[PDB]
Design a protein around this ligand. Structure first.
Ligand SMILES: Nc1nc2c(ncn2[C@@H]2O[C@H](COP(=O)(O)OP(=O)(O)OP(=O)(O)O)[C@@H](O)[C@H]2O)c(=O)[nH]1
Ligand SMILES: [Mg+2]
Ligand SMILES: [Mg+2]
Lengths: 147, 191
């Protein structure tokens, strides 16, 4: 089993979070990952692209737990799976879990919707603002409901 | 020319992304550590942009670069802190604030007005805003003396907030309890 799943923007706004043991979600764990990533940017050594990733490129860090993540480009989004000490079996489970999440995300055209909602005035709220949860609320609850 | 703007800055964990989220959506939502700035252009139709800058030491240059290009168009800066931090442990926070003031006071004729936004007011160990401000002022004097003694081994600025050209006010708030009326009045003055 893995520990947590999180989807968030480079600005720190959270689109989705999941804790496997039903426990209160730990922002502290995700924040220790992010702050490590800022301090130590990735190199070739952290790269993971194999059959278990469905041809997506991931990166894997150890925070002294493990964090396997994908950085989507359009729009800019982090998808991260956390877990315990590495084994053969757990690096497979996590890698297949993340590739699955992305395929399911992309099947629900969530990335495309976010980009569309940013265009023009039609989705602006009463503060003249485009809220990233604007008009993807129903697609997100469907993403929820496959977990 | 640039669009007028108001800047939200300060240490990690203070509540900057939380405030911009509340101001723009009327809701309190989960956040994590920021790696890039968050902007709201033409806020409430006023022509003014609100921008939240990451607080991580290694990303401070984003705010410095923005002030070098745009300081003449900035209407105010909000310096946010977690009110529960021990007021005898403010060195890193005071270094950040004095580094901001060196730029704001020197890049404009009358400086840039500062709100010290003392967040998390509902927590038991939250300290009063006038005590935080007095503690920061004291620690900034110590930072300046340390830097002067090292240089023998900030001329635009002992140190007192009152002697700055810009105004500096400190008010409590709570984002989680939706209790930020004095901050919203200050913003409405600068818009
Ligand atoms: N108790 C309490 N916690 C708050 C309040 N406002 C924000 N927080 C919490 O403080 C933490 C940090 O808030 P953020 O907005 O992410 O902090 P930030 O200043 O943007 O931090 P960086 O992005 O790292 O620079 C989060 O866990 C928030 O939920 C508040 O009024 N009271
Ligand atoms: Mg932030
Ligand atoms: Mg004065």
């Amino acid at each position: 089993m893995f520990d947590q799943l999180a989807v968030f923007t480079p600005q720190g706004q959270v689109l989705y979070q999941y804790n496997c043991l039903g426990k209160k979600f730990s922002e502290i764990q995700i924040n220790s990952f992010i702050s490590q990533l800022i301090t130590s940017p990735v190199t070739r050594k952290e790269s993971v692209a194999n059959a278990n990733t469905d041809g997506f490129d991931f990166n894997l860090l150890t925070i002294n737990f493990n964090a396997l993540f994908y950085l989507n480009k359009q729009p800019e989004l982090y998808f991260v799976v956390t877990f315990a000490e590495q084994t053969l079996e757990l690096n497979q489970e996590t890698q297949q879990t993340l590739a699955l999440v992305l395929k399911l995300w992309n099947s629900l055209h969530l990335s495309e919707s976010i980009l569309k909602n940013r265009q023009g005035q039609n989705e602006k709220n009463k503060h003249n603002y485009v809220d990233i949860l604007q008009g993807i609320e129903d697609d997100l609850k469907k993403f929820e409901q496959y977990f | 020319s640039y669009q007028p703007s108001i800047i939200i800055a300060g240490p990690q964990n203070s509540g900057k992304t939380s405030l911009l989220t509340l101001l723009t959506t009327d809701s309190v939502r989960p956040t994590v550590v920021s790696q890039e700035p968050l902007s709201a252009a033409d806020y409430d139709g006023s022509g003014v942009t609100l921008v939240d800058f990451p607080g991580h030491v290694k990303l401070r240059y984003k705010l410095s670069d923005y002030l070098k290009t745009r300081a003449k168009f900035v209407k105010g800066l909000i310096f946010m802190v977690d009110s529960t931090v021990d007021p005898k442990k403010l060195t890193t926070t005071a270094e950040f604030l004095v580094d901001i003031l060196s730029i704001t006071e020197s890049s404009c004729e009358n400086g840039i007005d500062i709100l010290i936004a003392c967040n998390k007011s509902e927590l038991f160990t939250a300290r009063p805003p006038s005590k935080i401000k007095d503690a920061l002022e004291s620690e900034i004097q110590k930072v300046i003396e340390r830097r002067k003694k090292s240089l023998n081994e900030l001329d635009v600025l002992g140190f007192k907030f009152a002697n700055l050209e810009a105004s500096v006010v400190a008010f409590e708030g709570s984002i989680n309890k939706r209790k930020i009326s004095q901050w919203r009045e200050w913003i409405d003055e600068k818009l």
